[PDB]
Amino acid sequence: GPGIYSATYSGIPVYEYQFGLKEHVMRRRVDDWINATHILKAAGFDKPARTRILEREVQKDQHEKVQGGYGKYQGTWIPLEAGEALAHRNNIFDRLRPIFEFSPGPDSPPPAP
Amino acid sequence: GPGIYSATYSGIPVYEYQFGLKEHVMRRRVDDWINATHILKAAGFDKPARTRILEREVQKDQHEKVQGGYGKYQGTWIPLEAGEALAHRNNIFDRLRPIFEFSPGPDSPPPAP
DNA sequence: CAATGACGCGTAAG
DNA sequence: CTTACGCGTCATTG
């Protein structure tokens, strides 16, 4: 049962769309920035192909590299509009649309143990 | 035997004090910042112990966290005087004396912002 | 050129 | 306490 959950990493509240069931995509609560590494990962790209596209394409624009600390939070972060376009271009939007069409009130529930 | 060596990791020149002979403490050449994680490892502290010390004490001052890259370079980096203070507070300055007292000659770098 | 396992850090969760 | 996580270098391979 895929769904959007609340989580906090290094004091940073995020929305975590769980699906797969072990796959996930994170969106920040404060600025709605999304993890582009998660998106490319959902598109089926392996590690070298991901490092390639991130270096060559994604990081040519406004972005934030996160190299610490918790693994699942790490990656390259970009504005939501940039992440949505990246998902559409890699034909992965249908698997990812809940995290893009999410408009929160208070507040998303905690994840599973 | 145990002594000071000069290495380069990810294009970053450091001074490295080796002893054990597998233990080490790195001091950066460009700003004399020292690896606080190496220091606490030189003391008897294991992972959760130094995790608490780094988070509750060391991180509350001027610091830089490094994850990824060459493994042994990783850790929490702090200015040299803060490193000397930390080494004293945790009763390990004497064993690590050469990495604090080493001097190439002319001349030490100023306090970074 | 590209791939990939080792490394080991800061974090999180059991 | 224990494990799990993913990253970016380095050495090594094809």
Residue numbers in the entry:
A (entry chain B), B (entry chain A): 14 to 33, 36 to 128
What's in the article?
The four DNA binding proteins, MBP1, Swi4, Res1 and Res2 all have the same arrangement of domains, each consisting of an N-terminal DNA binding domain (DBD), a C-terminal heteromerization domain and a central ANK(Ankyrin) repeat region. Swi4 binds to the SCB (Swi6/4 dependent cell cycle box) motif, 5′-CACGAAA-3′, while MBP1, Res1 and Res2 binding to the MCB (Mlu I cell cycle box) sequences with consensus 5′-ACGCGTNA-3′. To clarify whether the DNA binding mode of MBP1 and its orthologues is similar to previously characterized wHTH domain, we have determined the crystal structure of the DBD of PCG2, the orthologue of MBP1 in the rice blast fungus Magnaporthe oryzae, bound to an MCB–DNA motif. Taken together, our data reveal that the MBP1 homologue PCG2 utilizes a novel DNA-binding mode that is distinct from those identified in other proteins with wHTH domain.
The asymmetric unit contains two protein molecules (monomer A and B) and one double-stranded (ds) DNA molecule (14bp, strands C and D). Monomer A and B have a virtually identical conformation with an RMS derivation of only 0.7 Å for their main chains. Both of them comprise a discontinuous, anti-parallel β-barrel structure (β1–6) packed against a loosely associated bundle of four α helices (A–D) with the topology of secondary structures elements arranged in the order β1-β2-β3-β4-αA-αB-β5-β6-αC-αD. In monomer B, the C-terminus was turned towards the N-terminus and located close to the DNA binding site, whereas the residues from 121–128 in monomer A were located further from the DNA binding site. In the complex, the MCB–DNA adopts a right-handed B-DNA. However, in the MCB–DNA as compared with the ideal B-DNA, major groove is narrower and the minor groove wider. The structure reveals that the wing (80-loop), helix B, the 20-loop and helix A are important for MCB–DNA binding and notably, that the wing and helix B recognize the minor groove and major groove of the DNA respectively. The conserved Glu-X-Gly-X-Gly-X-X-Glu (QXGXGXXQ) motif in the 80-loop is located in the minor groove of DNA and contains the residues that make the majority of protein-base interactions with the MCB–DNA. Three types of interactions are observed in this interface. These include the side chain of Q89 that makes hydrogen bonds with the N2 and N3 of dG3 and the side chain of Q82 that is hydrogen bonded to the O2 of dC4 and the N3 of dG5. In contrast with most wHTH structures, helix B is not the main mediator of DNA binding with only two residues (K62 and R65) making contacts with a base and a phosphate of the MCB–DNA. Interface-1, formed in complex A, comprises a larger buried area than interface-2 in complex B (1729.4 Å2 versus 1330.0 Å2) and contains many more hydrogen bonds (26 versus 8) suggesting that there is a greater degree of specificity and affinity in the monomer-A interaction over the monomer-B interaction with DNA.
